[PDB]
């Protein structure tokens, strides 16, 4: 502690708004680098320097006021890169014991502090001016090393998880990430990233710039981002007032339902009743104590508690909630998406795929590739759609690449038990890219150009002719697990399956498409009967449970697919389940049932079919209890 304190304090003193450096500050930062290179496994020097706030106190002023001293400046850059190194790299993995997890949290906290400090615009101003000089110069080993360390510093400062206990910030208040992005915008380093992506002379940095862009966009999604016009602020003011109004009215309605559920007498107003026609758990009739108003809508679980499901059985949950970034940052990010899609997408994505071909990329950089393939394609689909700006990734090669990556992640999820959630998150990225490619090949049919219509028919013909793109949905549904995959994965999978079946229906009903794969015959309803499985309907019902929280498009997709599977294939008895009937009971008893007309009508249809079967025979009630295989044909 003492030697580190002496060496760090040796660097310089800060006077007001100016920083004065001691003559041996270069040797001082070299000593700090030496200590960091000889840390303990607890990352003790990183902890101590973060606690001392030496980065904010000394290195940022040195960066912003003594960048002319080049031998000091590059050492300061390397030191900042080492200090800002992400905690997962510092420890190798997320620890699983209390002491090392505490050390991880402490280092992470100091990374929060570093990210908050780097939002000062002068830091990225100096970095952008330096990198501008370097790219004008671009060439030496030291020069490209300095470029790499500047880009790694930007990557490091962008890549910290936000401590949302302290960043517990509302709808469009500027987060630390928002302020960092705004500082990048004001310093003009976004223009340098655009130059690196658009330029063909230095494509080795294209992978790094893709990483920088992927870390820039984390809260945002393209459909909302593309619609941020200049007049959006006034619209969002009125929208916020309307949302508050409907929320308050909903809460008042819920309060009144609860008030009418209980009586108007006080809690200890006694009196007990016997329900003569209702047996208790014994032989005698049930004695009820909670009042007539609780009997008016009687349930046999009023007094019970939920069960403690064990840790290994609990469902997965969402890792994020949609706080928007500040509106100015949203405008800047929309402009960045526009310029990136126009000037940068094709060359950068070709260079990144070339990097994957050369196989010098790290072990999971295709996740960044598939992120961009989802994000910027969907941004192009939003607002004015133009396939010419994004032509490169429409190749069938991208479909094959996504398919092999998705199947690899699927197998690793099924085998690599200790890392299954991360493999699920990678498979979700691949699924999202696949969905967006299905969306764009759907979209371009509406375009007026015969050439891209020809390209669309080519892509659809080969993609529906090749079987492995087709059977992947059945594989995903058959091995979907709520315990590992969040509800957003299931939502995206259902949306993708609905879109894929829609396009396949249109293709088969407008063209022959008579053979698949070595040709073998094919018809559309044969493939649809594959989805007539207990697991598939179980997953669809699992997503249907959240119908209030689901988007309207998600409800449309789920009810459309279930209505297809029940009506057109004539397999209503597959959907006869008692959990499903509880879902329908809550759906029909919903006060907001009028907003879900398709869902309630479908529920009444399937219920009418069930009660027809029940009127035929009493066996329907017993068969309703248990999930059911192809022997359902007895019931039908």
């Amino acid at each position: 502690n003492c030697e580190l304190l002496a060496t760090c304090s040796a660097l310089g003193y800060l006077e007001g708004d100016t920083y004065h450096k001691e003559p041996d500050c270069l040797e001082s930062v070299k000593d700090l680098i030496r200590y960091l290179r000889h840390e303990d496994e607890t990352r003790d020097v990183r902890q101590q320097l973060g606690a001392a706030q030496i980065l904010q106190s000394d290195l940022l002023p040195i960066l912003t006021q003594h960048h002319q001293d080049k031998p000091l400046f590059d050492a300061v850059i390397r030191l900042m890169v080492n200090l800002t190194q992400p905690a997962l790299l510092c420890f190798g993995n997320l620890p699983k014991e209390p002491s090392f997890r505490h050390h991880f949290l402490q280092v992470l906290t100091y990374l929060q502090a570093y990210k908050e400090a780097f939002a000062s615009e002068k830091a990225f101003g100096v970095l952008s001016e330096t990198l501008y000089e370097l790219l004008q110069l671009g060439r030496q080993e030291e020069d490209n090393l300095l470029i790499e360390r500047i880009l790694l510093l930007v990557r490091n400062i962008l890549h910290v998880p936000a401590d949302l206990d302290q960043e517990k910030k509302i709808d469009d208040d500027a987060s630390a990430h928002d302020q960092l992005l705004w500082a990048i915008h004001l310093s003009g380093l976004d223009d340098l990233l655009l130059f690196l992506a658009s330029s063909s002379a230095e494509e080795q940095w294209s992978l790094h710039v893709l990483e920088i862009v992927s870390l820039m966009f984390r809260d945002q999604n393209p459909e909302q981002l593309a619609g941020v016009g200049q007049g959006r602020l006034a619209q969002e003011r009125s929208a916020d007032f309307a949302e508050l109004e409907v929320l308050r009215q909903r809460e008042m309605a819920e309060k009144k339902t609860r008030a009418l559920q209980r009586g108007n007498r006080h809690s200890r107003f006694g009196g007990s009743y016997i329900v003569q026609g209702l047996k208790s758990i014994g032989e005698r009739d049930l004695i009820f104590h909670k009042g007539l108003h609780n009997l008016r809508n009687y349930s046999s679980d009023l007094g019970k508690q939920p069960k403690k499901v064990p840790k290994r059985r609990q469902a997965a949950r969402e890792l994020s909630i949609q706080r928007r970034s500040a509106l100015n940052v949203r405008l800047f990010l929309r402009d960045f998406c526009s310029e990136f899609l126009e000037n940068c997408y094709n060359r950068l994505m070709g260079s990144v795929k070339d990097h994957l071909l050369r196989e010098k990329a790290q072990q999971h950089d295709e996740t960044y590739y598939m992120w961009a393939l989802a994000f910027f394609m969907a941004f192009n689909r939003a607002a004015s759609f133009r396939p010419g700006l994004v032509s490169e990734t429409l190749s069938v090669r991208t479909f094959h690449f996504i398919e092999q990556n998705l199947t690899n992640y699927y197998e690793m999820m099924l085998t690599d038990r200790k890392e299954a959630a991360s493999w699920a998150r990678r498979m979700h990225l691949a699924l999202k890219a696949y969905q967006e490619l299905l969306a764009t090949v759907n979209e371009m049919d509406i375009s007026p150009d015969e050439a891209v219509r020809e390209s669309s028919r080519i892509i659809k013909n080969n993609i529906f002719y090749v079987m492995e793109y087709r059977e992947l949905f059945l594989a995903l549904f058959r091995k979907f697990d709520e315990r590992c995959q969040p509800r957003s994965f299931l939502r995206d999978l259902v949306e993708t399956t609905h879109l894929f079946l829609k396009m396949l229906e249109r293709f088969c009903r407008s063209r022959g498409n008579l053979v698949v794969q070595s040709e073998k015959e094919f018809n559309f309803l044969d493939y649809l009967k594959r989805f007539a499985c207990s697991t598939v309907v179980r997953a669809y019902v699992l997503l249907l449970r959240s119908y209030q929280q689901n988007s309207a498009h998600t409800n449309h997709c789920i009810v459309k697919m279930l209505h297809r599977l029940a009506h057109d294939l004539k397999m209503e008895a597959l959907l006869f389940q008692l959990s499903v009937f509880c879902l329908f009971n809550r759906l029909l008893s919903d006060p907001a049932a009028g907003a879900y007309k398709e869902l309630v009508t479908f529920a009444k249809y399937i219920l009418g079919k069930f009660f027809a079967l029940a009127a035929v025979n009493q066996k329907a009630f017993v068969e309703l209890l248990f999930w059911k295989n192809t022997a359902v044909v007895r019931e039908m």
Binding site: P306, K307, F611, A614, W627
Partner: protein, 87 residues
Amino acid sequence: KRNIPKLDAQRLISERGLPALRHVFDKAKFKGKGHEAEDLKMLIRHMEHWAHRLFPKLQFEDFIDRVEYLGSKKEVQTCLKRIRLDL
């Protein structure tokens, strides 16, 4: 000591289980077309009562989540195909 009930296939094939479920709806009546919500409420009320009598420890939805899995087992399945049709 430790006389804790379990809700396994032996519980489900007990008298209160599927043999009872074969008979609980003998007293029931339904309105049919255009009143499927009311018929559903009566249906869930009857089977919720049956679940409560069979295994009072659980809430109804949790009981359904248990039993929908537990029906796969061979003992309760053989008793199911006995209850279906007749012995």
